[PDB]
Design a protein around this motif. Structure first.
Motif, PDB file in Angstrom:
ATOM      1  N   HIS B   1     -43.209 -13.536  -0.945  1.00  0.00           N
ATOM      2  CA  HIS B   1     -43.059 -12.950   0.431  1.00  0.00           C
ATOM      3  C   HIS B   1     -42.007 -11.855   0.528  1.00  0.00           C
ATOM      4  N   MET B   2     -41.348 -11.556  -0.597  1.00  0.00           N
ATOM      5  CA  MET B   2     -40.283 -10.542  -0.699  1.00  0.00           C
ATOM      6  C   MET B   2     -40.581  -9.132  -0.182  1.00  0.00           C
ATOM      7  SD  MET B   2     -38.838 -11.584  -4.498  1.00  0.00           S
ATOM      8  CE  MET B   2     -37.431 -10.421  -4.497  1.00  0.00           C
ATOM      9  N   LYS B   3     -39.539  -8.458   0.325  1.00  0.00           N
ATOM     10  CA  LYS B   3     -39.638  -7.077   0.822  1.00  0.00           C
ATOM     11  C   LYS B   3     -38.345  -6.263   0.605  1.00  0.00           C
ATOM     12  CE  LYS B   3     -40.967  -4.177   4.721  1.00  0.00           C
ATOM     13  NZ  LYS B   3     -41.418  -4.152   6.147  1.00  0.00           N
ATOM     14  N   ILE B   4     -38.486  -5.007   0.181  1.00  0.00           N
ATOM     15  CA  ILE B   4     -37.328  -4.143  -0.070  1.00  0.00           C
ATOM     16  C   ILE B   4     -37.538  -2.719   0.473  1.00  0.00           C
ATOM     17  CG2 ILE B   4     -35.746  -3.247  -1.804  1.00  0.00           C
ATOM     18  CD1 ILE B   4     -36.592  -5.402  -3.702  1.00  0.00           C
ATOM     19  N   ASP B   5     -36.605  -2.247   1.302  1.00  0.00           N
ATOM     20  CA  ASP B   5     -36.701  -0.908   1.890  1.00  0.00           C
ATOM     21  C   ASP B   5     -36.274   0.208   0.924  1.00  0.00           C
ATOM     22  OD1 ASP B   5     -35.966  -2.920   4.308  1.00  0.00           O
ATOM     23  OD2 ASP B   5     -37.180  -1.281   5.111  1.00  0.00           O
ATOM     24  N   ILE B   6     -37.085   1.266   0.830  1.00  0.00           N
ATOM     25  CA  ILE B   6     -36.783   2.390  -0.059  1.00  0.00           C
ATOM     26  C   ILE B   6     -36.726   3.699   0.719  1.00  0.00           C
ATOM     27  CG2 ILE B   6     -37.373   3.607  -2.190  1.00  0.00           C
ATOM     28  CD1 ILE B   6     -36.936   0.737  -2.719  1.00  0.00           C
ATOM     29  N   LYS B   9     -37.722   5.613   5.144  1.00  0.00           N
ATOM     30  CA  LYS B   9     -38.774   4.859   5.849  1.00  0.00           C
ATOM     31  C   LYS B   9     -39.754   4.050   4.987  1.00  0.00           C
ATOM     32  CE  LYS B   9     -38.938   8.652   9.276  1.00  0.00           C
ATOM     33  NZ  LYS B   9     -37.917   9.421   8.482  1.00  0.00           N
ATOM     34  N   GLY B  10     -39.595   4.099   3.665  1.00  0.00           N
ATOM     35  CA  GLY B  10     -40.522   3.392   2.796  1.00  0.00           C
ATOM     36  C   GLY B  10     -40.156   1.978   2.405  1.00  0.00           C
ATOM     37  N   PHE B  11     -41.031   1.336   1.634  1.00  0.00           N
ATOM     38  CA  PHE B  11     -40.774  -0.024   1.182  1.00  0.00           C
ATOM     39  C   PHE B  11     -41.702  -0.509   0.078  1.00  0.00           C
ATOM     40  CE2 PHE B  11     -44.506  -1.899   2.999  1.00  0.00           C
ATOM     41  CZ  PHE B  11     -44.711  -1.340   4.272  1.00  0.00           C
ATOM     42  N   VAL B  12     -41.312  -1.635  -0.512  1.00  0.00           N
ATOM     43  CA  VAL B  12     -42.063  -2.303  -1.559  1.00  0.00           C
ATOM     44  C   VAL B  12     -42.099  -3.778  -1.146  1.00  0.00           C
ATOM     45  CG1 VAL B  12     -42.062  -3.068  -3.946  1.00  0.00           C
ATOM     46  CG2 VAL B  12     -41.480  -0.722  -3.427  1.00  0.00           C
ATOM     47  N   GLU B  13     -43.302  -4.306  -0.952  1.00  0.00           N
ATOM     48  CA  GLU B  13     -43.463  -5.681  -0.514  1.00  0.00           C
ATOM     49  C   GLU B  13     -44.397  -6.487  -1.428  1.00  0.00           C
ATOM     50  OE1 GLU B  13     -45.946  -6.086   3.083  1.00  0.00           O
ATOM     51  OE2 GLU B  13     -44.356  -7.388   3.852  1.00  0.00           O
ATOM     52  N   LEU B  14     -43.968  -7.695  -1.796  1.00  0.00           N
ATOM     53  CA  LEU B  14     -44.753  -8.573  -2.657  1.00  0.00           C
ATOM     54  C   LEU B  14     -45.728  -9.401  -1.820  1.00  0.00           C
ATOM     55  CD1 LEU B  14     -45.388  -9.998  -5.353  1.00  0.00           C
ATOM     56  CD2 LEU B  14     -43.530 -11.576  -4.779  1.00  0.00           C
ATOM     57  N   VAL B  15     -47.011  -9.370  -2.178  1.00  0.00           N
ATOM     58  CA  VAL B  15     -48.018 -10.116  -1.421  1.00  0.00           C
ATOM     59  C   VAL B  15     -48.473 -11.422  -2.084  1.00  0.00           C
ATOM     60  CG1 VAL B  15     -50.175  -9.933  -0.172  1.00  0.00           C
ATOM     61  CG2 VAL B  15     -48.837  -7.894  -0.623  1.00  0.00           C
ATOM     62  N   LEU B 165     -47.119  -3.710 -16.089  1.00  0.00           N
ATOM     63  CA  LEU B 165     -45.958  -3.589 -15.231  1.00  0.00           C
ATOM     64  C   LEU B 165     -44.745  -3.163 -16.058  1.00  0.00           C
ATOM     65  CD1 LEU B 165     -44.942  -6.241 -12.569  1.00  0.00           C
ATOM     66  CD2 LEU B 165     -43.268  -5.010 -13.964  1.00  0.00           C
ATOM     67  N   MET B 166     -44.621  -3.686 -17.276  1.00  0.00           N
ATOM     68  CA  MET B 166     -43.500  -3.320 -18.137  1.00  0.00           C
ATOM     69  C   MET B 166     -43.635  -1.887 -18.662  1.00  0.00           C
ATOM     70  SD  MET B 166     -42.470  -6.855 -20.216  1.00  0.00           S
ATOM     71  CE  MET B 166     -44.129  -7.514 -20.562  1.00  0.00           C
ATOM     72  N   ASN B 167     -44.863  -1.371 -18.695  1.00  0.00           N
ATOM     73  CA  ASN B 167     -45.106  -0.001 -19.138  1.00  0.00           C
ATOM     74  C   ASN B 167     -44.686   0.960 -18.016  1.00  0.00           C
ATOM     75  OD1 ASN B 167     -46.392   1.981 -21.053  1.00  0.00           O
ATOM     76  ND2 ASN B 167     -47.688   2.350 -19.249  1.00  0.00           N
ATOM     77  N   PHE B 168     -44.931   0.555 -16.775  1.00  0.00           N
ATOM     78  CA  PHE B 168     -44.571   1.357 -15.613  1.00  0.00           C
ATOM     79  C   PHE B 168     -43.054   1.501 -15.543  1.00  0.00           C
ATOM     80  CE2 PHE B 168     -43.102   1.283 -11.132  1.00  0.00           C
ATOM     81  CZ  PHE B 168     -43.685   2.451 -10.643  1.00  0.00           C
ATOM     82  N   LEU B 169     -42.338   0.418 -15.858  1.00  0.00           N
ATOM     83  CA  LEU B 169     -40.876   0.413 -15.820  1.00  0.00           C
ATOM     84  C   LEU B 169     -40.240   1.272 -16.922  1.00  0.00           C
ATOM     85  CD1 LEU B 169     -39.974  -3.335 -14.932  1.00  0.00           C
ATOM     86  CD2 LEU B 169     -40.157  -1.389 -13.370  1.00  0.00           C
ATOM     87  N   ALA B 187     -36.928  -1.406  -7.300  1.00  0.00           N
ATOM     88  CA  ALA B 187     -37.420  -2.453  -6.418  1.00  0.00           C
ATOM     89  C   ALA B 187     -38.507  -3.285  -7.122  1.00  0.00           C
ATOM     90  CB  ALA B 187     -37.960  -1.839  -5.137  1.00  0.00           C
ATOM     91  N   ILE B 188     -39.360  -2.635  -7.904  1.00  0.00           N
ATOM     92  CA  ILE B 188     -40.404  -3.363  -8.606  1.00  0.00           C
ATOM     93  C   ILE B 188     -39.802  -4.316  -9.638  1.00  0.00           C
ATOM     94  CG2 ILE B 188     -42.282  -3.164 -10.279  1.00  0.00           C
ATOM     95  CD1 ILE B 188     -43.040  -2.611  -7.373  1.00  0.00           C
ATOM     96  N   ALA B 189     -38.711  -3.896 -10.268  1.00  0.00           N
ATOM     97  CA  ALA B 189     -38.049  -4.713 -11.279  1.00  0.00           C
ATOM     98  C   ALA B 189     -37.337  -5.947 -10.706  1.00  0.00           C
ATOM     99  CB  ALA B 189     -37.063  -3.858 -12.057  1.00  0.00           C
TER     100      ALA B 189
END
Ligand SMILES: Cc1cc2nc3c(=O)[nH]c(=O)nc-3n(C[C@H](O)[C@H](O)[C@H](O)COP(=O)(O)OP(=O)(O)OC[C@H]3OC(n4cnc5c(N)ncnc54)[C@H](O)[C@@H]3O)c2cc1C
Ligand SMILES: Cc1cc2nc3c(=O)[nH]c(=O)nc-3n(C[C@H](O)[C@H](O)[C@H](O)COP(=O)(O)OP(=O)(O)OC[C@H]3O[C@@H](n4cnc5c(N)ncnc54)[C@H](O)[C@@H]3O)c2cc1C
Ligand SMILES: Cc1cc2nc3c(=O)[nH]c(=O)nc-3n(C[C@H](O)[C@H](O)[C@H](O)COP(=O)(O)OP(=O)(O)OC[C@H]3O[C@@H](n4cnc5c(N)ncnc54)[C@H](O)[C@@H]3O)c2cc1C
Ligand SMILES: Cc1cc2nc3c(=O)[nH]c(=O)nc-3n(C[C@H](O)[C@H](O)[C@H](O)COP(=O)(O)OP(=O)(O)OC[C@H]3O[C@@H](n4cnc5c(N)ncnc54)[C@H](O)[C@@H]3O)c2cc1C
Lengths: 215, 213, 212, 214
Positions: B1-6, B9-15, B165-169, B187-189
């Protein structure tokens, strides 16, 4: 959930992510966005497949190598199989029942056809043991085992790819043995994503057997 | 349910998430036809020798909100699934990324950084007002939107597994990449770390190639 | 082969691996026009498309960014876009008045075209004002509109190419992308006539290609 | 160019699109200067920009033992087309005594060769027997050994082929498939000499390709 296939194989569900609504949430982003169930139907018939990529499954499967080889041809997925290089192979082969040859006129009776297959399996397996016992490396000693030997693997795949898999294997053109595994996969899929499944058969399914075989 | 503001006005949210560290252990351990002490050791082993297929059995679904220029870079990662908001199907919300003065921490400019901020907001406003104008004059939404700048915000869903995901990082969680994309990769990490402790640690110790984590 | 698209774009062929017979050899796993063309139609009609993956193309495209964002959504292919670290220019797509044809608009189509131009100039000037001022391009360029032109290399196989045509060479797709797809389609027809022929008859899911 | 592997297999080149420069042109997005174009290949390889190498493609025709094809088909970023066992030869991979060298066995190395040839013959006999009896091919073939040879076409790009060489042209992979990757490497070297050298110097993770030649 564990379903038994053939004389010694099986299909078992390990994990699952999401359900029918996952596809709906994913689709809402486009237009900024009971009714949900109607959206899935809509997506299906209009060709908007991507939303279903957000549903994922992981199965534990035990099957004869000749079936595994056909299954692995599906590239949009993840696999992990038991190694024939690092493990002692078990004495388990797929021996077709007599009723398998029903429909084909043969010189020898079905029991005879079945009797011979087993026989060749024993001579084959016995030799495999002399060699391993004699100091021969496993990775080389196993090349003598027949393609009807049982193997196990994990399979992680999403809904959209899975529907491509059912289109091709749950069909009368594919081999009888792998069709059995297809039905099991189809059953589990229906239990977890009933609306998506119903829409699938009614709108995009291209095969034949699933419109005549419950679950 | 996590969420982080970037950014502003942006964000990264886990669904959602499927599996955990053991998912990788079970998928791998099936090769030898087979305890806490052992399991962690197994994950590091796999990570050390590059056996990454097992980590493909861990999956994440995010909900991201970011400017178009960031999104474009992000979408180049093909081994994953995407669903975005359509600019040719709905009215666009006056939400653009306006860099703050600190963004120029290290660059000396003719005009004060505050003015650079002012200037960016102007051209953005002017472009936005022309968009609304053409729309109300009956112009097709897909056509009127082509006057909108690259800092306009968009939204999408992203389903990806642990290996990709590790390739993206390794690519975005690095100084060579744009500052804006870095912020999102950080935020993804943090989310990846939360859900897969052992895997994340093994990754930073025997494979992470970036330099900001 | 080069085809101009829109007001300043294009699609040009850069290289190709194989032809119709490449698919025939792959399906028979080995190595009479009539015999071969009958197989190509046979595979097409029954859905056995893997043989067509053994045919590949590489195009050099010049399109506006918004057209490019939809194009890049096709994952089963290879891309390389201009960054300015090896190869930069600045041109924009200004629609013709005929683009607003059919739609009844408040102001004349000729005015819609003018307003788009005006914004582009102001947006472009602001940009140069920022560079001459000392702001790095990576930041300065974020004020440029979506109709800014870009260039890329596209390498894709025949199976994926036919998927691209089922979705972009269709009326539900945006008009601008349609023009680029029609271009992609002509070139494909030139290099693999038999495969293109069978595609339109048994698998083509779109509409506009059978009308032109 | 064709190359023999094992006792009855091979690797054959069917087609190829582009060369080293196809990567250079893709990295610049354009269309001359050897010193420079070669300098770029190395830069790309050294700093990890590998997407330009996806613009070089190959198609091979391979003949190999089923236990080898299985390990091989494991590489997903590629295109495959194999012979149909349920629709589409008396050929099996019989190991040489020199293959069991370095292993302490209770019986003579030559006895192993004879033990393996015997079962292959037996199995094959019962198979041809069942076929004639009226049993369907897709069913009667389940008694054949894993060492039965098969054939397939393989289309793969340069970046994906480098991943295959990393994993298979290595001592940790079965000896059998190592031999194939060596042939794959030789063809690759012949068509893209600049990329191969750069690959070996900056990205290759295996061991044998720096020991053996071409
Ligand atoms: C008229 C129109 C409207 C559109 N509107 C939207 C919108 O609102 N939002 C949006 O996000 N997109 C939108 N799209 C983009 C569309 O959803 C697809 O992303 C695009 O057509 C690329 O197609 P693809 O996924 O089939 O192809 P590719 O990504 O190129 O893939 C080709 C084939 O491989 C597959 N495949 C590849 N990867 C995977 C995977 N990971 N899992 C399962 N199968 C896979 C499928 O069989 C696929 O057809 C639109 C497209 C059109 C033509
Ligand atoms: C600092 C930086 C600078 C950049 N500069 C440029 C530039 O100038 N021009 C430009 O176009 N892009 C540029 N990019 C984008 C970059 O080239 C890749 O497109 C991006 O990193 C997506 O990565 P990927 O291919 O590794 O990932 P994914 O597409 O997600 O793929 C992950 C893995 O699967 C693979 N793979 C997937 N598909 C294929 C295939 N078809 N063939 C072979 N292997 C495949 C590889 O092993 C790959 O690492 C840049 C990125 C960064 C971080
Ligand atoms: C010595 C050795 C021992 C092995 N032992 C076993 C064993 O016991 N059991 C077993 O099951 N397998 C085993 N394998 C097979 C191994 O697990 C891989 O499946 C095989 O190497 C294929 O590699 P790949 O994933 O790198 O390549 P490809 O499938 O060709 O993919 C190339 C690149 O694209 C990527 N990619 C493609 N698809 C996806 C995806 N869906 N998600 C994330 N990234 C993706 C990655 O960046 C990848 O490297 C073994 C291999 C070797 C060399
Ligand atoms: C009844 C039957 C008979 C068969 N007979 C033979 C035979 O004689 N010989 C043989 O070699 N095989 C045979 N096959 C295997 C068949 O050729 C395919 O390899 C198999 O069905 C896997 O399917 P797929 O490509 O659709 O799926 P996946 O590999 O899982 O791919 C799913 C989607 O992504 C796509 N995609 C993935 N990768 C690529 C790519 N590289 N290029 C373009 N699109 C891509 C397409 O849109 C595709 O539908 C047979 C299969 C069946 C069901």
């Amino acid at each position: 959930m564990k379903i038994d296939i053939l004389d010694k194989g099986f299909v078992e569900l390990v994990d699952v992510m999401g359900n029918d609504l996952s596809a709906v949430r994913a689709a809402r982003v486009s237009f900024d966005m009971e009714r949900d169930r109607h959206l899935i139907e809509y997506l299906m018939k209009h060709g908007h497949e991507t939303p279903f990529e957000h549903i994922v499954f992981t199965f534990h499967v035990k099957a004869p190598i000749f079936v595994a080889r056909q299954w692995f041809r599906h590239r949009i997925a993840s696999y992990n199989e038991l190694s024939g290089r690092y493990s002692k192979l078990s004495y388990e082969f797929y021996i077709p029942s007599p009723e398998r040859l029903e429909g084909y006129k043969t010189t020898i009776p079905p029991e005879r056809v079945t009797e011979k297959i087993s026989e060749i399996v024993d001579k084959a397996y016995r030799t495999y043991l002399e060699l391993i016992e004699s100091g021969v490396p496993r990775e080389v000693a196993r090349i003598v085992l027949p393609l009807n030997l049982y193997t196990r693997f994990f399979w992680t795949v999403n809904a959209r790819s899975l529907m491509n898999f059912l289109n091709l294997r749950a069909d009368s053109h594919a081999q009888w043995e792998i069709q059995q595994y297809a039905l099991a996969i189809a059953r589990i899929f229906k239990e977890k994503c009933p609306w998506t499944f119903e829409a699938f058969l009614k709108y995009a399914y291209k095969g034949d057997i699933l419109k005549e075989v419950q679950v």
